[PDB]
Amino acid sequence: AIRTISKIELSKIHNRYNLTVDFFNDLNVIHGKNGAGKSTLIHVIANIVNGDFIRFAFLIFEEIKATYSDGLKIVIRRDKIDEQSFISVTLSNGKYIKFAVGEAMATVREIESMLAMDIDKFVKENELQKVRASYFPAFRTMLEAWSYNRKASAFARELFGQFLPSINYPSPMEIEDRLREEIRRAQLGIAAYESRTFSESFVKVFSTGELLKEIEGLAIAIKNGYYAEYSKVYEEIRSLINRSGALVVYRDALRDRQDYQEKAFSEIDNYMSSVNSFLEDKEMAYDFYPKVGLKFPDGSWSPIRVLSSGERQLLTMLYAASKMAIVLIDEPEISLHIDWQEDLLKRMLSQLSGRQIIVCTHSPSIATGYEDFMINISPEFI
Amino acid sequence: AIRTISKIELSKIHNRYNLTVDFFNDLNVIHGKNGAGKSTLIHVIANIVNGDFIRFAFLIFEEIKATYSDGLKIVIRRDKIDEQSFISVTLSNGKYIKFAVGEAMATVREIESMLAMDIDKFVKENELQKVRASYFPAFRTMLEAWYNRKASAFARELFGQFLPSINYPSPMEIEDRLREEIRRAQLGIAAYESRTFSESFVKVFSALTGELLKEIEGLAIASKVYEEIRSLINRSVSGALVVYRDALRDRQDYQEKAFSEIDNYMSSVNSFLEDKEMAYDFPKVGLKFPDGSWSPIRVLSSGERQLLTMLYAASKMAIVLIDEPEISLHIDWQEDLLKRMLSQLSGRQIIVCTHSPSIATGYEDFMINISPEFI
Amino acid sequence: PKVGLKFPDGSWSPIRVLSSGERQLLTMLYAASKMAIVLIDEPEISLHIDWQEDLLKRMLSQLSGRQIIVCTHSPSIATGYEDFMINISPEFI
Amino acid sequence: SNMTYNNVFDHAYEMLKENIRYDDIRDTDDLHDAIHMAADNAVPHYYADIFSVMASEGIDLEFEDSGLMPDTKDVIRILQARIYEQLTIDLWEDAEDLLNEYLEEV
Ligand SMILES: Nc1ncnc2c1ncn2[C@@H]1O[C@H](COP(=O)(O)OP(=O)(O)OP(=O)(O)O)[C@@H](O)[C@H]1O
């Protein structure tokens, strides 16, 4: 990210309490018991950072101040004139926009667009959408229930109010299709690099025993291509090896084929290693059309339906951490054993580097090893 | 080898006349004035040879005898007993099928199938569909108005239900067919490129004179890597050069073999046409004026459209029955049509029925004059 | 009322049974009666020589006092009125 | 470097716009053949490009209509038919607004 959040001041939100939280540029582990408005704070941040300030028309507040790292100040006030409420979003740059709450309510019931275009023009001419924040809700089981889905945003705004931001989160029943599509697409990518290597190596060939030994070693080196005819041309190459400059060209082509073979599947092998780091006595893999699922040391195969809520939380969180700015995670301790809660932040900090990772947990087991980042929330009741 | 039709005898057809026609083994050019029953003979032949015996329930006749070349005789009789008509299809081998006319009429109005399956079993167990005859109708402008499958029902609606199956291409379908064939040939060339790449890769790996290099440079013509190969050629190792030359020669031969069927059809069309050339430059298919201007296949006159619809349906071809090929044609094209089609359609029985003797020039020994002996 | 064809044997048949030339004569001699300038394009479609040598004379008996412009590919239409032939050749540029 | 599905879809969109502008297609009935006319000259013909387009995101690799898939053992023709079907499906969505833009053009 660039404009990291430094300090957010919420005054009289829901007419109950005032809250001012200072954030670092790094990890932000907010620890506090339920009812602290942590979820609200996350929705406020996700409705400020991602340019969706129109959702603030559905929120009851007095004064909301958001300060970034570079020095941009956003002051939001809810003032009503002649029985009609107007939200004033005043930036530190000089410009300020104001709009009626009822106009935004009418626009939302229209979606069931002038103000939407006005908000888009305001955030585009002021460049308020430089950093996009990803929202990980604490109700991802509900996203599994209506199995990224786009109607889930409307369902969650239906039963949690219209202040809720856009919901883009992957279900267990969508990541199976996503993984199958990515594996077949990577196999097709391997086949296209085979055909490009054939045409380029034809042109290059048209223009020692160690090179022959290297070709014999590289002939043996699942990762089989989709176009099996090229696997049969490779079988014929191995059969010919069993039976100068052009040999160097052949060796370079085989080495580039092996390197692209590793590089096409490296992203999914990283995700599989990230999953299998937690899991014990059970491996998630892509044994063979691609089949994706669990494997056991007995050699038995099993569908992804045997997985527990804990393992489902790990799948839905590690896939949505690899496929990534500012990352906001709500309740990562759900249905997890204490050791996985201990190692979850270290695994996600190993896979998500270079971004502002804000997490909100109720269990302190999540915040081991990062106790200096533990910002304790406290509601200052009005 | 092939069961060609030798002699057809129609007795009291439409309760009007008797007709007995003897055919040669090839080029039966029937010449006669309008009202002599030429198409009444072509429809009978097309309803006998192609197994469409159900159409004989819609025909009023007394005795129809069909003799093939080997000696197979099929005798069809329409006899009515107790106010119900029965068609008796008696073969010379001993077997014979009979059926009621009203049952076949009810089956035809049902299509608008037991008897159809019985007829199919009868013609399959006797092997009557060894030779299939193609019918070129005299109303192909109506086929231009509407291979199309509803055209059979439309033509049987306005010409009676005795009319055989109509399978004839319109101009806008030979245009779609030519575009599809060009696209398929391009896809075939591209797949032969990738197959050539993989096999030549293997053969060059298997490998380990200047005239061969000069021949390979001369044979290069233009598909992107081959341009780079020609550019590199313009700027011990004999076996790999031989493999390169053989691969280039096989690529050129496959391009010629892919486009040979359409180059033959284009040459056959452009043989007649004089001040306009039909070609497939880049796919758009159409005319090519000597100025270099292009025009759609809609600019063609009725004459040239008859030549397009007849030369495509002769190239995409047994027994061929053509009815009135002299429609809307100038006299020189009438002179040369049989010679061009006999050069392009060899090995089949070409029966033509013409009103103008100009079609039968150079084949006057084949001119069989039809004559209806009115009862 | 019923319009059809009477054979000399006395049988009665509908108008479906006519051949191509008889259909051409029915469509051509009827519109000639219900008629100005008559522009006829290719009257020789599916007609033998004997009818082609007389069709123009019969239609001129049908059409009198009107300008007739016909276009033909066979010269058998042009017989009997051979002094009115206009050979045409386009001037290509 | 490589050709993706989005470049092919943009080329097919440009060819469909050119066909609408030139041939003057006014309704969906002529556009049902104009979409094939634009699609069959924009499909790749170098094998590598085909696989690179099929290996990119945005286009699935399965036939929603099993009858549209031809009955042959040529895999590359199956993938090309999938490209043609997905291009027709995606261009039929934009056909209505392309027709409206053409009507507002004149
Ligand atoms: N149902 C019928 N179908 C066909 N012709 C019939 C029928 N009933 C009577 N006829 C007569 O039988 C003769 C055969 O007509 P047909 O069309 O076969 O002759 P044609 O002049 O040789 O044909 P064409 O002009 O199609 O080459 C005609 O004299 C016609 O009037």
Curated annotation (Swiss-Prot), chain D:
Keywords: Early protein, Host-virus interaction, Inhibition of host innate immune response by virus, Restriction-modification system evasion by virus, Viral immunoevasion. Prevents both degradation and modification of T7 DNA by the host restriction-modification complex. Structural mimic of the phosphate backbone of B-form DNA that binds to and completely occupies the DNA-binding sites of all known families of the complex type I DNA restriction enzymes. Thereby, inhibits the restriction endonuclease activity and protects the phage genome as it penetrates into host cytoplasm. Inhibits host transcription by binding to the bacterial RNAP and competing with sigma factors. Inhibits the host exclusion defense system BREX. It comes from Escherichia phage T7 (Bacteriophage T7). GO terms for biological process: symbiont-mediated evasion of host restriction-modification system; symbiont-mediated suppression of host innate immune response. Homodimer. Interacts with HsdM (AC P08957), the M subunit of host type I methyltransferase restriction enzyme M.EcoKI; 1 Ocr dimer binds to M.EcoKI. Interacts with HsdR (AC P08956), the R subunit of host type I bifunctional endonuclease and methyltransferase restriction enzyme R.EcoKI; 2 Ocr dimers binds to R.EcoKI. Interacts with host PglX/BrxX (AC P0DUF9); this interaction inhibits the enzymatic activity of PglX/BrxX through high-affinity binding. Forms a 2:2 tetrameric complex with phage T7 OCR. This is Protein Ocr. It holds the Pfam family ocr. The keyword Hydrolase does not apply. The keyword RNA-binding does not apply. Changing residue 51 to D: Partial loss of inhibition of the host exclusion defense system BREX. Gene3D superfamilies: DNA mimic ocr (1.20.120.780). The lineage of its organism: Viruses, Duplodnaviria, Heunggongvirae, Uroviricota, Caudoviricetes.
